Amino acid sequence: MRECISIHVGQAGVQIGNACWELYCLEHGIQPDGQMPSDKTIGGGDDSFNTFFSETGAGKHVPRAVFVDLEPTVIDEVRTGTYRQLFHPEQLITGKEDAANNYARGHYTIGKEIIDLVLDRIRKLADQCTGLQGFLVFHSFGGGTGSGFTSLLMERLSVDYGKKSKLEFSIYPAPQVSTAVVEPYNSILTTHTTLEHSDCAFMVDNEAIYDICRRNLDIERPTYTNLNRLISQIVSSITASLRFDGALNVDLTEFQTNLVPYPRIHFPLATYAPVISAEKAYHEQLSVAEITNACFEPANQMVKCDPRHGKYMACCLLYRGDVVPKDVNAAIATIKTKRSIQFVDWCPTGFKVGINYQPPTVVPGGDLAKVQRAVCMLSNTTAIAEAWARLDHKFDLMYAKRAFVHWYVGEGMEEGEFSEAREDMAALEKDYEEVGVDSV
Amino acid sequence: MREIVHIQAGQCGNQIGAKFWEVISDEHGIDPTGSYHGDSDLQLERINVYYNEATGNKYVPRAILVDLEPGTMDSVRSGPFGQIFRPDNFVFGQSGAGNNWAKGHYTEGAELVDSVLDVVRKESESCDCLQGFQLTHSLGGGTGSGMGTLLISKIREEYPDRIMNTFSVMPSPKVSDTVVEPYNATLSVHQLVENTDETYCIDNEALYDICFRTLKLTTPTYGDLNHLVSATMSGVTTCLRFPGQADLRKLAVNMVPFPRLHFFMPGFAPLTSRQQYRALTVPELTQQMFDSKNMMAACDPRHGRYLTVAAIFRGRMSMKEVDEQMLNVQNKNSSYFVEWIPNNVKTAVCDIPPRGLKMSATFIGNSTAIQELFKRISEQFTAMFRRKAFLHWYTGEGMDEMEFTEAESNMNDLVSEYQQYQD
Numbered sequence: 001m002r003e004c005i006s007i008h009v010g011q012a013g014v015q016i017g018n019a020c021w022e023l024y025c026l027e028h029g030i031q032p033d034g035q036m037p038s039d040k041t042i043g044g045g046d047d048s049f050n051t052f053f054s055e056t057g058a059g060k061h062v063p064r065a066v067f068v069d070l071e072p073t074v075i076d077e078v079r080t081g082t083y084r085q086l087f088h089p090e091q092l093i094t095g096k097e098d099a100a101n102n103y104a105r106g107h108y109t110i111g112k113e114i115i116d117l118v119l120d121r122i123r124k125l126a127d128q129c130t131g132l133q134g135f136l137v138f139h140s141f142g143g144g145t146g147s148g149f150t151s152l153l154m155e156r157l158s159v160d161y162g163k164k165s166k167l168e169f170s171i172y173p174a175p176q177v178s179t180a181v182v183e184p185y186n187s188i189l190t191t192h193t194t195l196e197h198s199d200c201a202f203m204v205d206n207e208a209i210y211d212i213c214r215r216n217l218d219i220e221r222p223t224y225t226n227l228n229r230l231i232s233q234i235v236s237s238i239t240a241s242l243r244f245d246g247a248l249n250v251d252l253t254e255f256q257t258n259l260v261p262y263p264r265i266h267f268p269l270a271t272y273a274p275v276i277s278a279e280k281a282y283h284e285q286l287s288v289a290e291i292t293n294a295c296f297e298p299a300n301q302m303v304k305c306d307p308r309h310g311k312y313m314a315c316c317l318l319y320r321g322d323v324v325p326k327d328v329n330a331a332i333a334t335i336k337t338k339r340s341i342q343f344v345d346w347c348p349t350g351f352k353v354g355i356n357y358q359p360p361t362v363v364p365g366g367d368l369a370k371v372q373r374a375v376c377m378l379s380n381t382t383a384i385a386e387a388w389a390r391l392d393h394k395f396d397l398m399y400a401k402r403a404f405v406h407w408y409v410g411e412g413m414e415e416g417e418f419s420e421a422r423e424d425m426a427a428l429e430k431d432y433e434e435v436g437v438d439s440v
Numbered sequence: 441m442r443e444i445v446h447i448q449a450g451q452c453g454n455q456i457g458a459k460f461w462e463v464i465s466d467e468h469g470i471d472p473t474g475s476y477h478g479d480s481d482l483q484l485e486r487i488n489v490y491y492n493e494a495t496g497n498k499y500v501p502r503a504i505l506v507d508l509e510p511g512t513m514d515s516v517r518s519g520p521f522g523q524i525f526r527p528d529n530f531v532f533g534q535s536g537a538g539n540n541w542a543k544g545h546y547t548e549g550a551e552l553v554d555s556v557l558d559v560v561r562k563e564s565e566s567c568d569c570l571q572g573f574q575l576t577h578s579l580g581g582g583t584g585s586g587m588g589t590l591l592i593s594k595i596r597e598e599y600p601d602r603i604m605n606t607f608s609v610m611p612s613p614k615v616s617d618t619v620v621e622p623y624n625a626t627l628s629v630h631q632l633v634e635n636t637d638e639t640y641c642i643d644n645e646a647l648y649d650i651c652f653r654t655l656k657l658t659t660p661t662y663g664d665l666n667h668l669v670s671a672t673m674s675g676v677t678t679c680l681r682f683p684g685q686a687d688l689r690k691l692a693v694n695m696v697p698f699p700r701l702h703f704f705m706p707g708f709a710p711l712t713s714r715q716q717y718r719a720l721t722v723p724e725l726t727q728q729m730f731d732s733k734n735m736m737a738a739c740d741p742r743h744g745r746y747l748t749v750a751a752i753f754r755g756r757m758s759m760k761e762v763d764e765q766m767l768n769v770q771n772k773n774s775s776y777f778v779e780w781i782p783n784n785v786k787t788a789v790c791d792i793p794p795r796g797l798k799m800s801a802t803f804i805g806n807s808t809a810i811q812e813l814f815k816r817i818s819e820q821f822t823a824m825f826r827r828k829a830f831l832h833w834y835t836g837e838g839m840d841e842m843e844f845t846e847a848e849s850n851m852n853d854l855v856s857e858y859q860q861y862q863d
């Protein structure tokens with residue numbers, strides 16, 4: 001019951017999915033062949049981890065996941081990698097020719113040739129669920145598949161599953177690791193097209209993760225592997241409420257109630273701590289107070305923005321590991337006196353807390369120290385609209401000259417779709433201003 | 441044989457209800473397996489009020505457990521006295537209510553409600569003469585609030601001349617799970633105004649302050665709060681569970697002078713921290729019982745006036761000294777009792793004390809000061825509703841804004857009604 005189906009779209013979605021499912025297996029004690037010796041109910045069960053893993057009669061624990069990409073080379077590494085036995089072959093779907101960093105090819109020219117097969121595979125996963133809760137969709141904003149095919153898939157999932165919840169983990173582009181000049185175009189197009197189909201979206205700014213790796217982990221030139229290991233820890237913190245049971249556990253959906261005051265205002269800001277190397281963590285035990293205070297350090301946010309220059313509409317603290325409410329309450333009291341956390345006047349100001357007792361885990365060969373306790377803060381702040389503004393400005397510079405637009409028109413799109421998408425973004429920026437103004 | 445049918449709905453409703461049945465099962469000498477092992481005939485005199493007698497001298501609570509998710513009732517079934525409940529009396533769905541009054545009242549709750557009524561009807565059909573019903577629930581969630589008030593409405597349709605009583609936990613931003621609690625509580629309060637005869641208002645803020653300030657608990661939990669609710673529920677039902685006077689209707693007739701003003705503030709004494717073996721004198725019991733700090737609605741009685749007051753004293757004590765102290769509290773603070781209801785302060789005594797105490801006192805007030813509770817809720821409701829904040833959770837279930845505006849006016853009318861009798 002309460003199953004969650006994960007969908008990983010494009011290179012960024014697939015590679016982040018690799019890191020997440022490896023981490024999940026380590027947290028739950030699942031071996032690369034899918035066996036889980038601690039699971040005494042063979043072939044089934046209703047344990048908390050069954051939200052993300054189905055079971056076969058042979059004792060295999062199989063991720064409730066589909067991997068999809070329009071070219072094969074990334075998913076091919078999964079097919080031949082360490083966890084190749086984890087997935088059934090039909091869960092890994094590839095085409096031959098990718099979207100060439102063109103939303104139009106991902107949503108139309110190329111995506112339309114594989115969308116039906118993808119939906120059929122998702123249906124096979126749904127049929128095995130006794131109480132499907134919804135989907136988790138991982139994808140980049142900047143790639144042609146991550147943008148165009150994700151939006152096509154989200155539209156089709158609304159039709160085939162109605163208002164069943166769909167959450168996103170969306171990779172927001174940064175110049176240090178970007179691969180296409182037109183990524184601002186693709187980002188605005190998919191954000192516009194997906195907006196009414198997504199119930200909640202966690203943006204991950206690649207530049208924020210890049211800075212954290214360089215600053216806190218002493219990684220000179222972070223790679224996708226470095227970035228994805230950190231992203232997986234944040235993803236794990238957010239989904240841990242769904243995969244583990246506990247007296248103090250609070251379900252992600254209950255945080256969602258507080259985080260989304262209006263349908264379009266559904267982009268929480270995530271902050272994670274502690275991010276520290278083994279060399280620095282040695283003999284340095286980071287307390288509940290220390291990791292909590294770090295949550296309000298802007299340098300630890302998953303999206304670059306200044307919450308001090310906006311207003312809060314919600315603040316949630318998701319703890320895991322050796323944490324008890326007494327220490328949380330004391331930590332929060334301190335913060336409430338040294339940081340002015342300004343809420344809009346129409347919203348309560350109490351922090352919402354959940355605790356999962358299962359301690360954090362790390363993948364061998366990684367950069368993060370193993371820690372006894374960690375926290376992910378999820379806040380709804382008007383400041384996250386800064387991320388839209390930066391993207392919209394790059395869009396405007398190019399679109400005023402119609403640079404690169406012929407690539408999209410040549411694949412069937414119309415200039416009207418660009419202005420329509422950009423106007424929706426302008427309205428969204430204005431919405432974020434409006435909700436922050438005090439009531440009359 | 442004046443049977444009462446007990447219903448507990450949602451997470452809060454089932455967790456407080458489970459503790460209530462643990463407390464009174466102990467008082468009546470009923471073990472977790474339903475077998476009687478007391479030593480006083482007073483334990484069984486009125487046992488059929490809350491328990492059905494099964495084969496083999498087994499006593500089974502006349503209780504129905506309701507929820508839209510399985511988690512909490514799984515905990516109850518595995519809890520201390522979980523095995524004492526009738527297995528068929530567990531009625532639950534899988535979807536959950538998402539802290540959403542509309543889901544409990546109009547969609548998810550609507551799909552399950554008929555099966556709950558089947559169990560209610562079954563229990564009512566085996567009653568020699570049913571008094572009425574008691575429901576335990578919170579108002580700030582979705583199942584207890586939304587589906588609980590749906591159940592009350594359908595029970596009144598099928599049993600229109602039976603008394604409906606609730607223990608209703610009021611939300612507070614100090615002890616809050618979600619921000620929509622004032623929405624759910626405002627929607628429920630109107631249902632209660634229309635469809636219950638008596639509602640005990642239990643404010644989570646008052647329960648917290650008692651645990652933190654008086655009981656000196658550094659980190660109060662929901663369990664600590666429920667300990668106070670269990671003790672209070674046992675206190676206010678003593679006169680129903682032991683020889684006295686008497687039944688729900690007679691209580692209502694002497695407590696409720698106007699039909700809509702049926703929301704009570706309960707209180708308990710002693711409330712002692714761990715100096716716990718000290719003997720408590722009748723004056724101490726009487727002074728604390730009327731102290732605002734001993735009350736669980738988070739309303740200052742000195743801000744309003746008592747329409748009616750009931751006080752129950754438990755334990756082997758001097759009934760002569762009880763009257764002297766009671767008559768002393770009234771005749772020393774008569775400015776807070778309306779003078780147009782003569783002799784509106786009634787006192788009752790019960791010989792059997794609660795477990796672990798030589799004597800205790802329970803307080804039931806129908807005070808116009810309860811308007812402060814409804815004012816707090818109304819202000820929190822409007823702060824969000826002015827901006828239509830979080831409404832999409834409710835319109836997605838088919839509700840319209842007009843229903844929120846009507847609930848807003850209904851509760852402000854209720855506040856206005858209390859204010860006229862306070863002057």
Ligand SMILES: Nc1nc2c(ncn2[C@@H]2O[C@H](COP(=O)(O)OP(=O)(O)OP(=O)(O)O)[C@@H](O)[C@H]2O)c(=O)[nH]1
Binds near residue numbers: 140145225
């Ligand atoms: N954090 C992270 N970002 C990635 C990763 N792979 C790609 N990206 C980012 O994703 C954007 C490019 O999109 P991709 O996911 O590679 O493209 P795609 O979805 O495969 O679509 P096409 O190749 O155009 O068909 C750039 O901003 C990259 O920096 C990854 O593994 N981790």
Ligand SMILES: Nc1nc2c(ncn2[C@@H]2O[C@H](COP(=O)(O)OP(=O)(O)O)[C@@H](O)[C@H]2O)c(=O)[nH]1
Binds near residue numbers: 449453539611
């Ligand atoms: N006193 C008390 N209040 C509770 C408890 N559990 C939840 N609440 C309160 O009830 C409201 C949440 O409703 P809940 O019963 O959990 O939702 P439901 O399961 O949908 O009915 C909030 O105001 C909580 O503070 C409990 O065990 N004791």
Ligand SMILES: Cc1cccc(C(=O)N2CCC(C(N)=O)CC2)c1
Binds near residue numbers: 264265827832
């Ligand atoms: C479909 C639907 C229905 C109701 C609200 C929205 C919504 O997301 N906003 C953004 C916030 C804005 C405001 N309050 O200033 C109002 C519209 C969308």
Ligand SMILES: Cc1cccc(C(=O)N2CCC(C(N)=O)CC2)c1
Binds near residue numbers: 352665
């Ligand atoms: C102060 C108090 C008293 C009694 C119980 C609680 C409690 O366990 N929660 C759950 C978590 C919730 C939150 N804000 O996250 C607050 C209520 C808190």
Ligand SMILES: [Ca+2]
Binds near residue numbers: 039043055
């Ligand atoms: Ca199993």
Ligand SMILES: [Ca+2]
Binds near residue numbers: 427430431434
């Ligand atoms: Ca607007």
Ligand SMILES: [Ca+2]
Binds near residue numbers: 551
């Ligand atoms: Ca249904």
Ligand SMILES: [Mg+2]
Binds near residue numbers: 071
């Ligand atoms: Mg690609």
Ligand SMILES: [Mg+2]
Binds near residue numbers: 451452581617
């Ligand atoms: Mg709850």
